[PDB]
Symmetry: C5
Subunit: 310 residues, 5 copies
């Protein structure tokens, strides 16, 4: 029974985040729990405060026509309880539900761990026999409690794109809204647990530049190479497989390269010094001691600029 | 109460993909979210545009006879919300639901990670008292939304096989339709994370051909063997166990052989060179320095041709 | 309202496998999706083709008395949707449902990975006021679609044990039927990924018989020992804890022993050859070179006979 | 509408275990599938065999008053299908359901892997308008199926404590019954997969007492220590964190000590023999060769006695 | 349709914890099973004990108006069974349900494993047309059974904050109540499994100060470095990623630093002693032997004070 109309029906939406949680990097999903609030004019429900009863009447959902509002990107239909439906004298219906869903929104891992993400909640409504278009009432979209926390992320803002995207799908009009939760990863913990140990085992690796023993050098460089393989695995398992190159994906690969030519060096110095050519072996190692750290820091400046400063 | 009929009821089908997600290589399952669209003529519902009310009349599912449409490959029956049901005057019914399922479709791992897959969604309907045959009207089959993304995969196309498979099952005829989602894996991230590190440690393995010390060579070759074991484990656990040989399964196995024969060699060189026979020790080691890369690259050309070019 | 009867009621059962999947070795459970088909005579529903309507009458489940058929081994009650109910003029009811459950059946790992299993689906019905006995209609019993696949398994047959097992449970007579799905693991993939690498690292361990270097030998034997521990873990974690000895559990253990006495040997040779007693050390090692492969191949002949050929 | 009562209603309870499964040591939960049977006198339901119908008639659950029987230690309320309800002419009601739940009962890990547990299923009933008390009818509590199995566990018995604990909770009387499933871990597989390898790498560790080589000793003792850490990890991840000390927790911890002072020995001997003090170095090592196995074996006697023999 | 009122409707609340379980550190959620008890005056229900039946009358929830009481920090709506509804003649309703939910409360990992937590359960009710204020009756709040246990945690208390926080949300008043479960972690098992082994491998690492062999020293220090990397991973994977520094995260990091300068030292000793400057190379190593344990103990006092002593 949609309200009989001379024009497009505006349903006013707002979302108030109550709890936010389980951001899944591999899955690129997050779970949300909130108030969805809808409001629309059905004048067939209009009344007189004095002549009709009291100020607002409440109906349960089976009474009224309610628009079917679905979230566009969600694994399953949201789980919702209807909190209230209240009709105002002029025919204004105010609906409030409390819902929970896990949303599917893509993530950009290019600056990971140093990445910020903008999560989307898309609302659509589909027209039949009268047009529906969604729009946002900003006073009920303000959207967060001060206790809302998303673990391991700082929550920057929750807002909505006010103009909907109206389009045709299978010979009917659909109206879509984009709600945006922007967040920034807390990169802190990555430093003691990942970045710094990586660095230590690399530096320890090239400690072999002040040594002449082939077996101690092989032992060093391959030990440290092992731990770097473990860190690459540790990191890679908690990330999805991207078509593109992440920032620490880049530095981790770069590191593989430094390990390779460090092994080339130790091998070459050893060969030279069983060739009775210790002058040239020694001059290579003397050089590496400067070359390796410097080219590392240069490559890292270049890399960092490439990912962040461009 | 089926529509009483003069011959088979054609149910016209379509699927419009909204979301795709959770492609599970081990499970060989993927999760889909879509519009299922059915239309059929039940003339008992035919009516009067002028005499009765409005142009098109709408029903809820409890009123009308609906055909029972099942998916063949699914863990469970779909979770569906009925979006709308609309009947036209001549008795044409248009049914629209939004469903979610995890589909069970087999995958071919032979060219993995460079593999391409065709996922299937099967619709069957079972007849009673008159035959039902499902068929596809392409305008509601057009499938993909343009933002459908399957993480770590490129979605190349979504189409439907127009001719249904009509056959006999338990003394009634069933009609089955095959919808096909073709996709290709994104192999990129495999290169920095698996292939290149694998190659690097194999090369580091061969650095022992320019050394004469048994212990540094053993240390080298068994260390790199260790990391290669780790890679074959990492790779193998994220894959199902196939009756056939996968491409990177082949290259990984081959790598095992190069490790073994490398060990045989270092062992042999050391033995010869404690046998007071450095002429043949040195000549073996020198030979291997050319032999191993050459045979590796030849084996890889042979293999790549074997898997892809065949 | 059970059919009032002059005799114990035969419910004819049958199962048609549509989907098979998720065989979980650790849990010893597998998931199935199929047709359950029932037929029984309720004469109260009997009617006349000529005077009564025409040939077959259809009911909803709430119309008819339906027998409660439960699966004996299932974690939870199955999820079933009723496909059809058809009554024939004489009072024969033909019921058809589509269900999905995870069946819980024990597995025999003695010959793992080279092993066959017989999976069971048990149906009971519980009698009241009239006896129920279940039995199978063999032609509504053809079990499979030609598209059923169980990952990592070859499906040999799906049949039903024709004579039911009738017994008393909680002071009433219950009737049980045994449906049997026999399967054999595809051992292929175990060979390149587990078995052969295990062997290689064992042989690599034995190169220490051609070396007199204590440290290169200790390095060898403990390195490969490490890899064998890793393989033991890889295999055993994907298995349940059996009260008995699995086949590859045995060979993995046997391998542990060969590693131990290899360490003993390496130890004894080094000790003998630092006491200036190299003659007997050398002849020990010489012997080992023959003994270890000989006793390995023998122990394995013994074991393989013991598990499979006995 | 409870049965009109001149006294407390005794509901007679019984449970028949059908399937048992998923004992989770970490969670301390197990999953059960069984018959719950209740019986009580509701005289309001009394009737005349001759005047009324037949001997006994059947109800669906909302016709009759049924007691609300809940499991006390359980994650969520059970999933139950009501199998039958039968009222006897005198007003005796016999209720039967088949339920499935995961039960939460604590486990005692002190003698693990050699530990036995008693799993509990607790029933409460809560009074209104007349007191309800649960009590146990042993003839329908009788056993499990004889095919009931709990993986990697031997099932000792299933019995019930006949006297209930009737007590006050939130100003009404609740009656609680304790059903006890006694079980014993099957420790077998722990011996080939955990105990024996642990020992082997420990002995291999002590092989360094017959060596004077500093580096072969460090390589030995440190390699084996690595594998022991791997075992400690493997074991501890499948167990919950106890405020107390387990048996293999003790054994593993002890082993750490033996590795440590083994390292101390190796270090002290090398130091002594670069002090040109080989007399006492050799005498230390010579002693260790006896002391380590002896103090180990006696410490194990002490430990075993301390945990098990009390 | 709430009870018609001249003032705010007070719903009196209480929670009695029955089972507690699944505290999840990374998710920062825990699962609870309890009694929710609500009581309020709805006078429309008032009655005469004598004319109608008995003293107190019972309803099913669908008859009466019940307040919608929601939990604030919870993932999905709780699963609830209504245990009892009892109306007193004056119109006082006493409602009792048994619920289970996973609550989402933040955790403070700063002193981990030595950390204490206060978990929160928040109840809101939302006003319409009459104010609702939740408040708590202490007698049905007693909250624990003497058997409530949370694995790996000791439970200090369960209480509720008596004053509700009444505030305005979306132009209706909401009343919120704070129940507090205080728990403290059981750190015991962390000592044998994590802390002490970490310490052993660090000490074993420092044995390299009593040795002059470069290769035995790098073998020592990098082996132990490996095992410590493994401990850091073992710990980090069972913890969430905090914006701050945890206590054992701090000591783990500090340990990394000690490994780094141990490597620097070992490297420097070797370099000086191939530079023919053994006097103070040796005197450096002599110093390290005291310095490292002393600075370790001072850094640990400093750190421990810093975390716990404030
Ligand atoms: Cl050297
Ligand atoms: Cl050598
Ligand atoms: Cl040697
Ligand atoms: Cl030495
Ligand atoms: Cl040295
Ligand atoms: Na070494």
């Amino acid at each position: 029974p949609p309200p009989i109309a001379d024009e497009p029906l505006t349903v006013n939406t707002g979302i108030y985040l109550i709890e936010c949680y389980s951001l899944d990097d591999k899955a690129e999903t997050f779970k949300v729990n909130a108030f969805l609030s809808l409001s629309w004019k059905d004048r067939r429900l209009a009344f007189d405060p004095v002549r009709s009863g009291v100020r607002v009447k409440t109906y349960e959902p089976e009474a009224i026509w309610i628009p079917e509002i679905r979230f566009v990107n969600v694994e399953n239909a949201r789980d919702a309880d209807v909190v209230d439906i209240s009709v105002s004298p002029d025919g204004t219906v105010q609906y409030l539900e409390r819902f929970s869903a896990r949303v599917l929104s893509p993530l950009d891992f290019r600056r990971y761990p140093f990445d910020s993400q903008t999560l989307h909640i898309y609302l659509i409504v589909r027209s039949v026999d009268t047009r529906n278009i969604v729009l946002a009432v900003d006073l009920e979209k303000v959207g967060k409690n001060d206790d809302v926390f998303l673990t391991g992320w700082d929550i920057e803002s929750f807002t909505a794109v006010v103009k909907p995207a109206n389009f045709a799908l299978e010979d009917r009009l659909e109206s879509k809204l984009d709600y945006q939760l922007r967040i920034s990863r807390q990169y802190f913990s990555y430093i003691p647990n990942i970045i710094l140990p990586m660095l230590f085992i690399l530096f320890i690796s090239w400690t072999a530049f002040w040594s002449t023993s082939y077996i101690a050098n092989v032992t060093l460089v391959v030990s440290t190479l092992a731990a770097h393989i473990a860190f690459n695995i540790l990191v890679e398992t908690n990330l999805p497989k991207t078509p593109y190159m992440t920032y620490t994906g880049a530095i981790i690969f770069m590191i593989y390269l430094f390990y390779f030519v460090a092994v080339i060096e130790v091998t070459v110095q050893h060969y030279l010094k069983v060739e009775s050519q210790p002058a040239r072996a020694a001059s290579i190692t003397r050089a590496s001691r400067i070359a390796f750290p410097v080219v590392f820091l240069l490559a890292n400046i270049i890399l960092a600029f490439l990912f962040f400063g461009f």
